[PDB]
Amino acid sequence: ELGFFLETGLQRAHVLYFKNGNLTRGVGRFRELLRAVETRTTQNLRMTIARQLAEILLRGMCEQSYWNPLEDPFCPQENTEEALLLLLISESMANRDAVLSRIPEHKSDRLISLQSASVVYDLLTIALGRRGQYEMLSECLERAMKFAFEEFHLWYQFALSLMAAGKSARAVKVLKE
Amino acid sequence: RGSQLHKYYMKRRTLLLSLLATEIERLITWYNPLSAPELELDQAGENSVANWRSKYISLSEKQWKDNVNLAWSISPYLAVQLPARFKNTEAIGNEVTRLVRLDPGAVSDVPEAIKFLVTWHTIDADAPELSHVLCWAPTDPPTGLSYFSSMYPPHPLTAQYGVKVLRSFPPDAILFYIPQIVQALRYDKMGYVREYILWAASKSQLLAHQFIWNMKTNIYLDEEGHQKDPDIGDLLDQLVEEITGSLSGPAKDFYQREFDFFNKITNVSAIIKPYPKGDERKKACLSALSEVKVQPGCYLPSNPEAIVLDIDYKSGTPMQSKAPYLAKFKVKRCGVSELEKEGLRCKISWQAAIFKVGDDCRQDMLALQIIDLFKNIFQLVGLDLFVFPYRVVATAPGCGVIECIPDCTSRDQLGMYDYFTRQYGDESTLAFQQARYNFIRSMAAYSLLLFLLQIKDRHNGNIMLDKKGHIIHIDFGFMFESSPDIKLTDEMVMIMGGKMEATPFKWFMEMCVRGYLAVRPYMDAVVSLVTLMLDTGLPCFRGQTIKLLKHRFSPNMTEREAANFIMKVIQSCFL
Incomplete structure (x- = not known):
């Protein structure tokens, strides 16, 4: 049903991999674990591993030190492409566990959900901004705008993205708010 | 280029002709209500206008969905206002909805433009996209609360829009609209309504008192109280416990003073309840009134815009019928903000109040709200009618405070033509004509009101005739489902001139x-x-009232036809 130490045995391997500097074998094992077909019991595991892989690939190495998942140094050809695909799938099947700002008496789960949304959209922004693509970024933040009710960060980022894309009046209204 | 300009001018000429014909028809309809062939106008052009009206009313659904396109090409605002100038075709609404859904940023005129966008689908409940309602302007409160009703499925963006529009008004409007806000808590899937309630209650004070009264009254189901509401009783009680106690200081002192004074004035009727009807009850109530002490700084909740000064200690009088009793208080009216200043720091008239225990006082509130709205409409337009909005408040299950008009003269307890003549002289004097004018002013307004609201089972005991000549209706308890649509006997018909x-x-x-x-x-x-209010399960709301009420307004008909219908109804309402 749901054991306790099998996940420990699965995870300490890559923990040792990336704490002893075995970056290549660690990322290879991460990729192979992602290659497993998802079931109803591995969604959070693939969440965590996908997020960590996206981070390490974005801030770990250059473009000239990467090869396709099938080969060994849809088929991605460059690292930001696979990172973007990972971010899209993660956000797409993440958007259905939201809490939607109820706050009747409990807040902690809402805080965790807001943290996860903030970090995923932060990686999306940092990935898409460098390549000078602003339209899809603006649409992404516009879709994301549902969660926020009294949070400054998303309003500020949405206003900046709108003003940097060409549209002005909407930027003016958001800036007024 | 010739042909381009030719069509470019011809199409706009046709559109302008149609619009002008419609405007002229509406204006001449408002000019004289009845046909009145003696009061006529120029005959030549009217025939051409009517012929053009028939010609443009004889067209089909096609070549009619393109006029909307042309209007949008000219300017979006004209296209938005196009359906208001009624054209008996639903395609205009669908085309306008499609056009605005294609790009909604062009129009941001608050009142009517959002109703073409807010319903992506009335009950289908899908497609949550392109709904950037954060740019729109606030509307009237009643429209905003529709997003929490049993009509629209819940959605976060609509809830944010509703809280935004509700968070932009002075306290007087929400004080007026209080009884619906609490009932709106039934559909509060999120926590928006409750947190707004706490925010508002922490902001001001009088609204908090009205809160506490309303959830104290409505927590139970019956007047006596033996079964509680299984739906919202628990969190209602939780809110009652939470709201009070958080406040402190002078607000706490004012709350204690006012509530202790109200309880000490409420228990008097229960104390004098055991005494039976007769003089002994009068003496007991007078002794209790002498026992009644007053702490300065209190106010009458039925009129939160006044400060009470003193009482008439020898006016305690119960009414025939349970111990409902009358009182007279000499007070002074100052305002609202000044009342708040006086309450936190802690010309002159006399009013009569009636305290009642053992009946419901909510349908009267709803009727009073509707009457006040009608009076405001009539005042804004610039007509001359008359209604009186006497205040009524419910403070506990079965416990109500009713304001009374000073110098009341009930007609039944006080031959109408004979009394009019012998009191106001012959027909050739001034006071007789003034009384007749006031009689007509009151009668027309109240006949229209009763026809609209379908209040039945009326008798001669529900009519009060003041000294001036106006007439006032009371006891609207039976309404909308309970029981000749217009009462018209022969005596007032005689008085009003002898003939129709x-x-x-x-x-x-x-x-x-x-x-x-x-x-x-x-x-x-x-x-x-x-x-x-439909949901509250009153003995009036049975489910089918909405369709009948909507149909009685005649929403799909022009001005002359509506006037003909109302005249026919009035004529048929004579015997």
Whole structure:
């Protein structure tokens, strides 16, 4: 049903991999674990591993030190492409566990959900901004705008993205708010 | 280029002709309500206008969906206002909805433009995209509360829009609209309504008192109270416990003073309850009133815009019928903000109040709200009618405070033609004509009101005739489902001139027609207000009231036809 130490045995391997500097074998094992077909019991595991892989690939190495998942140094050809695909799938099947700002008496789960949304959209922004693509970024933040009710960060980022894309009046209204 | 300009001018000429014809027809309809062949106008052009009206009314659904396109090409605002100038075709609404859904940023005129966008689908409940309602302007409160009703499925963006529009008004409006806000808590899937309630209650003070009264009254189901509401009783009680106690200081002192004074004035009736009817009850109540002490700084909740000064210690009098009793308080009116200053720091008239225990006092509140809205509409337009909004408050299950009009003279307890003559002289004096005018002014308004609200089972005991000559209706308890649509005997018909061809009869008819025409366009607010109360399970709401109320307004008909219908109804309502 749901054991306790099998996940420990699965995870300490890559923990040792990336704490002893075995970056290549660690990322290879991460990729192979992602290659497993998802079931109803591995969604959070693939969440965590996908997020960590996206981070390490974005801030770990250059473009000239990467090869396709099938080969060994849809088929991605460059690292930001696979990172973007990972971010899209993660956000797409993440958007259905939201809490939607109820706050009747409990807040902690809402805080965790807001943290996860903030970090995923932060990686999306940092990935898409460098390549000078602003339209899809603006649409992404516009879709994301549902969660926020009294949070400054998303309003500020949405206003900046709108003003940097060409549209002005909407930027003016958001800036007024 | 010739042909380009030729069509470019011809199409706009046709559109302008149609619009001008419609405007002229509406204006001439408002000019004289009745046909009145003696009061005519130029005959030549009217025939051409009518022929053009028939010609443009004879077209089909095609070549009619393109006029919307042309109007949007000219300017979006004209296209938005196009359906208001009624054209008996639903394609205009669908085309306008499609056009605005394609790009909604062009129009940001608050009142009517959002109703073409807010419903992506009325009940289908899908497609949550392109709904950037954060740019729109605030609307009237009644429209905003529709997003929490039993009509629209819940959605976060609509809830944010509603809280935004509700968070932009002075406290007087929400004080007026209080009884619906608490009932709106039934559908609060999120926590928006409750947190707004705490925020508002922490902001001001009088609204907090009205809160506490309302959830104290409505927590139970019956007047006596033996079963509680299984739906919302628990969190209602939780809110009552939470709101009080958080406040402190002078606010706490004011709350303690006012509530202790109200309890000490409420227990008097229960104390004098054991005494039976007769003089002994009067003596006991007078002794209790002498026992009653007053702490300065209190106020009468039925009129939160005044400060009480003193009482008449020898006026305690119960009424025939349970111990409802009368009182007289000499007070002074200052305002609202000044009342708040006086309450936190801690000309002159006399009013009569009635305290009642053992009956419901909510349908009267709803009727009073509707009457006040109608009076405001009539005052804004610029007509001359008369209604009196006597205040009524419910403080506990079965416990109510009713304000009374000083110098009340009930007709039944006080031959109408004979009394009019012997009191106001012959027909050739001034006071007789003034009394007749006031009689007509009150009668037309109240006949229209009763026809609209379908209040039945009326008798001669529900009518009060003041000294001036006006008439006032009371006891609207049976309404909307309970029981000749207009009461018309022979005595007032005689008084009003002796015949239906008398001039005052014509005045009465024209005033009624003009009032109906003026009051027609607020069905949306009326429907929202009635639907928000529909659920409470009163002995009136049985389910089918909404369709009948909507149909009685005649929403799909032009001005002349509506005037004809109302005149026919009035004529048929005579015996």
